[PDB]
Design a protein around this ligand. Structure first.
Ligand SMILES: [Cl-]
Ligand code: NI
Length: 129
């Protein structure tokens, strides 16, 4: 599924991401835009052999099992394919674990490089939330 900006903002809010660990909703929408272009089916292979999955590009080395990443820890206890669903629940639940892991949203390279320190609440402007 390819979400619209406001549609995704609303779904993320309903799943409790607004101000989760102090990160306002715009941060999450911005991260999703630059990680996946709002596409739940996005996948990208990394140089180390792991793969990133879904709207928030969650990595198979640590967070989910894709059956081809040796030494995967599968900390979210889910197959990576679950992160590609039109229903973002599994992605949100896993992301909550990631952002609680110490480095906050810096875990997402696109967030650090393209969202951090910008006016992220532009991402939710005009939305009926
Ligand atoms: Cl933080
Ligand atoms: Ni990545």
């Amino acid at each position: 599924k390819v979400f619209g900006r406001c549609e995704l903002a609303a779904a993320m809010k309903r799943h409790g991401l607004d101000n989760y660990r102090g990160y306002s909703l715009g941060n999450w929408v911005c991260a999703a835009k630059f990680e996946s272009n709002f596409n739940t089916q996005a996948t990208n292979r990394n140089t180390d052999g792991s793969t990133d999955y879904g709207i928030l590009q969650i990595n198979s080395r640590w967070w989910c099992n894709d059956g081809r990443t040796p030494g995967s820890r599968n900390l979210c206890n889910i197959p990576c394919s679950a992160l590609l669903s039109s229903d973002i629940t599994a992605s949100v639940n896993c992301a909550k674990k990631i952002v609680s892991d110490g480095n906050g949203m810096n875990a997402w390279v696109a967030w650090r490089n393209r969202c951090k320190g910008t006016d992220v609440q532009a991402w939710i402007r005009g939305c009926r939330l």
